[PDB]
Amino acid sequence: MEAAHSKSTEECLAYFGVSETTGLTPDQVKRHLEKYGHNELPAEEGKSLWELVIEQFEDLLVRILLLAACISFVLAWFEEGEETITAFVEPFVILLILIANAIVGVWQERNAENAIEALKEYEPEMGKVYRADRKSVQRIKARDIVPGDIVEVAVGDKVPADIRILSIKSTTLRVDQSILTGESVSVIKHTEPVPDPRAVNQDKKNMLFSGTNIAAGKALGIVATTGVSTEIGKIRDQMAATEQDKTPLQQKLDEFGEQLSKVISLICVAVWLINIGHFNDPVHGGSWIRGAIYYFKIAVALAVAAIPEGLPAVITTCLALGTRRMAKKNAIVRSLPSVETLGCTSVICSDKTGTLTTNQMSVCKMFIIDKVDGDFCSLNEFSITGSTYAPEGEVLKNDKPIRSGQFDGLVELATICALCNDSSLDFNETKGVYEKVGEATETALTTLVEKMNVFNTEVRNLSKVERANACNSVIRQLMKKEFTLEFSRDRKSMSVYCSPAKSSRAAVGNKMFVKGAPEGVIDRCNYVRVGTTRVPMTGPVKEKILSVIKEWGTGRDTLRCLALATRDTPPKREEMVLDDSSRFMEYETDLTFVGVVGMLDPPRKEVMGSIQLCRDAGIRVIMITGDNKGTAIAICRRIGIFGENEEVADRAYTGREFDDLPLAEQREACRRACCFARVEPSHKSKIVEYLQSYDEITAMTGDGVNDAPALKKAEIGIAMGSGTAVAKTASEMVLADDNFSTIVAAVEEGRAIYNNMKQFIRYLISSNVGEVVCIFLTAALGLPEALIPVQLLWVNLVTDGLPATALGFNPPDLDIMDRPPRSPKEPLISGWLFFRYMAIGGYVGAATVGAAAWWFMYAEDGPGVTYHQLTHFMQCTEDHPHFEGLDCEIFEAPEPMTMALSVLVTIEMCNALNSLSENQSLMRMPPWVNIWLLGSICLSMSLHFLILYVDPLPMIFKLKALDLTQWLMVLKISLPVIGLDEILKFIARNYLEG
Numbered sequence: 001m002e003a004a005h006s007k008s009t010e011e012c013l014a015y016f017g018v019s020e021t022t023g024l025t026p027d028q029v030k031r032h033l034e035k036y037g038h039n040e041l042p043a044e045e046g047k048s049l050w051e052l053v054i055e056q057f058e059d060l061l062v063r064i065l066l067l068a069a070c071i072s073f074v075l076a077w078f079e080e081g082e083e084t085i086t087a088f089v090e091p092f093v094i095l096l097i098l099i100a101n102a103i104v105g106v107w108q109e110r111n112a113e114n115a116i117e118a119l120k121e122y123e124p125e126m127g128k129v130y131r132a133d134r135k136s137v138q139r140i141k142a143r144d145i146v147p148g149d150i151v152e153v154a155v156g157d158k159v160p161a162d163i164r165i166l167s168i169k170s171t172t173l174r175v176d177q178s179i180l181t182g183e184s185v186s187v188i189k190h191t192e193p194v195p196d197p198r199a200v201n202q203d204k205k206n207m208l209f210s211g212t213n214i215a216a217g218k219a220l221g222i223v224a225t226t227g228v229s230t231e232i233g234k235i236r237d238q239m240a241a242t243e244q245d246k247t248p249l250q251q252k253l254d255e256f257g258e259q260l261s262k263v264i265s266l267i268c269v270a271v272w273l274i275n276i277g278h279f280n281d282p283v284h285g286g287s288w289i290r291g292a293i294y295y296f297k298i299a300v301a302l303a304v305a306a307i308p309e310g311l312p313a314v315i316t317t318c319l320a321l322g323t324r325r326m327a328k329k330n331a332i333v334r335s336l337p338s339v340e341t342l343g344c345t346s347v348i349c350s351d352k353t354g355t356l357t358t359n360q361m362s363v364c365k366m367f368i369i370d371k372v373d374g375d376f377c378s379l380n381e382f383s384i385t386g387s388t389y390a391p392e393g394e395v396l397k398n399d400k401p402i403r404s405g406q407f408d409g410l411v412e413l414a415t416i417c418a419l420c421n422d423s424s425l426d427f428n429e430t431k432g433v434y435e436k437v438g439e440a441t442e443t444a445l446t447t448l449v450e451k452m453n454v455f456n457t458e459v460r461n462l463s464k465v466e467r468a469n470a471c472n473s474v475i476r477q478l479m480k481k482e483f484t485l486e487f488s489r490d491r492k493s494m495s496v497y498c499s500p501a502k503s504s505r506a507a508v509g510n511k512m513f514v515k516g517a518p519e520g521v522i523d524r525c526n527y528v529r530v531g532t533t534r535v536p537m538t539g540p541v542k543e544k545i546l547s548v549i550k551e552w553g554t555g556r557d558t559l560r561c562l563a564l565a566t567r568d569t570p571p572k573r574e575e576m577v578l579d580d581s582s583r584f585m586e587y588e589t590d591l592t593f594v595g596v597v598g599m600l601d602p603p604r605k606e607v608m609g610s611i612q613l614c615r616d617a618g619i620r621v622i623m624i625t626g627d628n629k630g631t632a633i634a635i636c637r638r639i640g641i642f643g644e645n646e647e648v649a650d651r652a653y654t655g656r657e658f659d660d661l662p663l664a665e666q667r668e669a670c671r672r673a674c675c676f677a678r679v680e681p682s683h684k685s686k687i688v689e690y691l692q693s694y695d696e697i698t699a700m701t702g703d704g705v706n707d708a709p710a711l712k713k714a715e716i717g718i719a720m721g722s723g724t725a726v727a728k729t730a731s732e733m734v735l736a737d738d739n740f741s742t743i744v745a746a747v748e749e750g751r752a753i754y755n756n757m758k759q760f761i762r763y764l765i766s767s768n769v770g771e772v773v774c775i776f777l778t779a780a781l782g783l784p785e786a787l788i789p790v791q792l793l794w795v796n797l798v799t800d801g802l803p804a805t806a807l808g809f810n811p812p813d814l815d816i817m818d819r820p821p822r823s824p825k826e827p828l829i830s831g832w833l834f835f836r837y838m839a840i841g842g843y844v845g846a847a848t849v850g851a852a853a854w855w856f857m858y859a860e861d862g863p864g865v866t867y868h869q870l871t872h873f874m875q876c877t878e879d880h881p882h883f884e885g886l887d888c889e890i891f892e893a894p895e896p897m898t899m900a901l902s903v904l905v906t907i908e909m910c911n912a913l914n915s916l917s918e919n920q921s922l923m924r925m926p927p928w929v930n931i932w933l934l935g936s937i938c939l940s941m942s943l944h945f946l947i948l949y950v951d952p953l954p955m956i957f958k959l960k961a962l963d964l965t966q967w968l969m970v971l972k973i974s975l976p977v978i979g980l981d982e983i984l985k986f987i988a989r990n991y992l993e994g
């Protein structure tokens with residue numbers, strides 16, 4: 001029964017055919033259980049370790065790699081010779097990476113919470129109901145409760161389902177609904193029907209929401225909905241339907257996969273089309289089998305050189321490091337892939353209270369009526385000092401300190417602030433600061449009465465824990481608070497019924513002290529107070545009060561204004577029903593206006609600046625606030641969102657105004673608006689949706705489960721540190737300090753991290769290109785394999801891994817925040833850069849093949865057989881080309897390979913330097929610009945020698961030490977790469993910029 005809040009109490013019982021006294025009969029329970037199912041959200045989809053491991057092999061690249069582990073395996077088997085010490089190494093190395101890859105992948109899934117599963121923290125195990133099969137109450141499992149049965153909840157209980165309250169047994173019922181309505185103050189529940197069938201949860205004052213807590217009292221009610229039909233259930237379904245896309249990088253990396261896999265196959269075909277010359281050879285002769293192994297062998301190499309095996313780990317390493325660095329700035333990122341997307345932030349939708357502002361309320365102006373005499377009218381405007389909650393400050397008129405007591409209006413003004421309040425101050429012996437007890441708004445009032453001290457009550461003698469609520473006490477001792485009519489959004493005011501203290505059996509003197517939003521309260525005033533006297537509210541004077549209020553709330557003061565008033569002749573105690581909030585407004589009629597107080601919720605001292613960085617970064621900032629439209633714009637102009645005098649007609653909307661617009665015009669509004677006030681539950685989510693239709697990477701804030709859907713949907717959901725765990729688990733980032741500026745700071749870090757990743761990413765893929773040139777060259781030509789798998793793998797995981805990781809620390813640019821947000825569709829490599837890496841690759845393809853073929857031609861220590869046509873044969877099934885001399889295994893000489901491997905390695909340490917900057921020569925930006933790079937290149941070489949002299953290794957890698965002569969040829973072929981890049985960089989600077 002979704003609409004239970006709008007139905008009468010008798011209507012719900014009638015609807016479910018149940019009696020309040022007996023409860024449901026076992027037949028009903030059974031029948032209802034089958035119609036509505038159990039009261040619980042569906043279980044998470046169980047993903048098994050097996051399935052969690054099989055997924056690790058879904059990526060195109062880890063599949064190609066696996067395939068190569070097979071070909072390599074098979075070959076390692078059906079191979080000639082007897083060296084099994086290095087034979088099965090190639091396949092086992094590949095497999096190990098595929099294993100560590102799985103282990104890591106699976107490891108992440110074990111420890112990784114999900115928002116949906118976090119909601120279940122709010123469903124209790126048990127609940128208490130009354131069923132026709134037993135007189136007494138019986139506590140059962142929440143899972144077994146059903147729509148229709150009578151339930152009982154008491155203070156401490158966690159509501160097991162969405163319940164329509166039938167009767168409140170205690171005196172009053174208070175509920176902690178924080179997780180659902182964001183209301184941190186417990187709210188009072190009634191049993192009268194709430195008329196609007198379309199009322200939002202906050203106004204359903206006759207409902208208990210599953211997952212909430214009974215703050216105080218005891219009540220009986222009928223279950224309206226259960227499971228996924230509850231408020232928290234509907235939130236669970238919205239989240240499950242929300243699908244977060246893959247980050248721009250992940251997508252680029254995915255497209256790279258398909259293509260790399262598509263190129264690897266075309267290079268194979270090619271190597272085949274270049275060896276078609278074998279179809280013109282006699283069937284007899286030639287060791288075919290020793291030719292098939294050659295193709296496959298290079299195929300494996302083809303793949304191993306094409307796949308940047310170490311990239312994923314570098315990215316991760318760099319991301320962990322940035323993350324730890326962002327934490328230092330209070331920005332807690334939960335998803336490493338989010339650091340990127342965060343830098344792309346196009347829009348930032350932020351809540352005002354506690355994020356843009358401090359939520360440290362302080363009254364700083366107040367006014368009463370000075371006198372009324374016909375058309376003439378004068379008010380008494382005042383000012384207060386002290387922005388804290390501490391009773392340290394003072395009232396001043398025309399800037400001159402006065403004593404409140406000398407004015408009567410202020411005595412009463414102060415009475416109202418003290419009595420019509422549920423808040424109090426408390427001095428922390430520890431922090432030595434006065435804390436607030438209750439709503440920030442009411443505490444500001446409490447703080448005000450202490451400063452005013454209408455009765456001059458000497459308090460300087462009193463301690464600090466006493467100074468706290470001194471003047472208040474004085475006022476409480478004067479009037480007796482008989483009861484209070486809670487605040488409610490419909491009437492936007494609250495009041496307390498009071499009777500004098502020192503008074504015997506009397507039927508006169510009772511008063512009501514009303515406080516609330518000015519327009520509503522002032523409208524219910526038929527009288528204005530002047531000191532101690534009273535006269536009829538006149539059109540004019542009502543304008544005077546209203547204009548000042550408009551000035552304080554709409555003007556630069558951006559003050560939250562409150563009208564204070566009294567009902568001199570309130571109704572008789574017995575003539576009031578303190579059960580139907582709906583009658584509270586009438587009770588607060590025929591009032592007497594006493595004055596206004598305007599408090600300030602100050603903007604964080606860093607937001608103005610952060611708002612400016614956003615404008616500089618081309619990032620739009622949208623404010624979402626509970627304030628009315630006028631004050632919301634005023635605050636927006638104040639913190640810089642809007643210009644002091646710019647037109648914002650169609651750039652700020654209220655929830656109501658927004659709903660009235662047709663879908664088409666709502667979408668349009670969302671591209672222009674920077675201010676949303678009085679926004680509905682479904683709005684944050686709709687705004688995100690509209691923003692995404694314009695392809696903007698959105699950042700949205702929130703803290704309760706009710707914000708969870710929106711947070712999940714926004715590219716970057718931002719949760720408050722002080723918010724719920726659900727909001728946190730549903731978000732990409734958590735603000736440890738709740739501060740808006742912490743967001744902007746995180747965005748810049750996000751831009752700097754990616755610029756670096758772009759460098760080490762292009763660096764790594766750049767080599768993989770060269771490696772694949774060498775393999776294709778050393779094949780289409782038919783030369784001895786220049787480089788082999790086990791070697792390449794070391795270069796891509798260790799040799800090139802270090803420089804890459806160091807690259808992640810390149811200093812960031814200065815105008816990092818003077819540039820607009822990066823387009824997600826922006827490729828990492830294209831245009832001239834593509835050509836640059838095209839050439840560089842062709843170069844590394846030669847520099848390797850050459851240094852290998854060099855040692856087989858013009859090299860001393862090696863077959864100085866120049867032009868000996870290594871091409872001619874690798875069969876030696878003839879030995880004819882070489883008359884005298886029995887030796888055909890020097891083709892496998894490890895000396896040349898070392899030349900290729902040292903060339904690669906050397907060039908990559910060089911290319912790592914060509915990476916410090918995309919287009920700046922090493923002239924303007926020297927290698928020492930990143931000391932971590934240098935130190936990293938020093939470590940990569942010390943590791944190169946490590947595998948050259950430490951016996952166990954040189955064999956495994958098929959390597960041998962080099963001559964100081966040869967090492968020079970390595971340099972004479974590597975070091976030039978830098979000049980090559982410099983020419984290319986140069987060409988891009990002064991011949992393609994503009």
Ligand SMILES: C/C=C(/C)C(=O)O[C@H]1C(C)=C2[C@H]([C@@H]1OC(=O)CCCCCCC)[C@@](C)(OC(C)=O)C[C@H](OC(=O)CCC)[C@@]1(O)[C@H]2OC(=O)[C@@]1(C)O
Pocket residue numbers: 252253255256259260261263264267305306307761765766768769770772773776827828829830834835837838841
């Ligand atoms: C990794 C190694 C190699 C050799 C590879 O196949 O890279 C290609 C490839 C798949 C792309 C290319 C390589 O393309 C070529 O070399 C063109 C064909 C001629 C090959 C002849 C070989 C003898 C990248 C690497 O290189 C250069 C130097 O042009 C740049 C870029 O890559 C990126 O932007 C990186 C994405 C994370 C991609 O065009 C990319 O495809 C895409 O979808 C992109 C957008 O991704």
Ligand SMILES: Nc1ncnc2c1ncn2[C@@H]1O[C@H](COP(=O)(O)OP(=O)(O)CP(=O)(O)O)[C@@H](O)[C@H]1O
Pocket residue numbers: 439441442487489492493494515516517518560561562626627
């Ligand atoms: N305890 C209280 N007593 C009387 N009036 C109050 C009040 N708290 C707020 N008001 C008045 O009611 C109007 C606001 O309604 P509400 O209190 O729900 O909004 P808000 O400004 O507190 C944001 P949120 O609803 O998100 O907490 C305020 O602008 C103020 O004038």
Ligand SMILES: [Mg+2]
Pocket residue numbers: none
């Ligand atoms: Mg409020």
Ligand SMILES: [Mg+2]
Pocket residue numbers: 182702703704707
């Ligand atoms: Mg919230």
Ligand code: NA
Pocket residue numbers: 244711712713714715716717730731732
């Ligand atoms: Na999200």
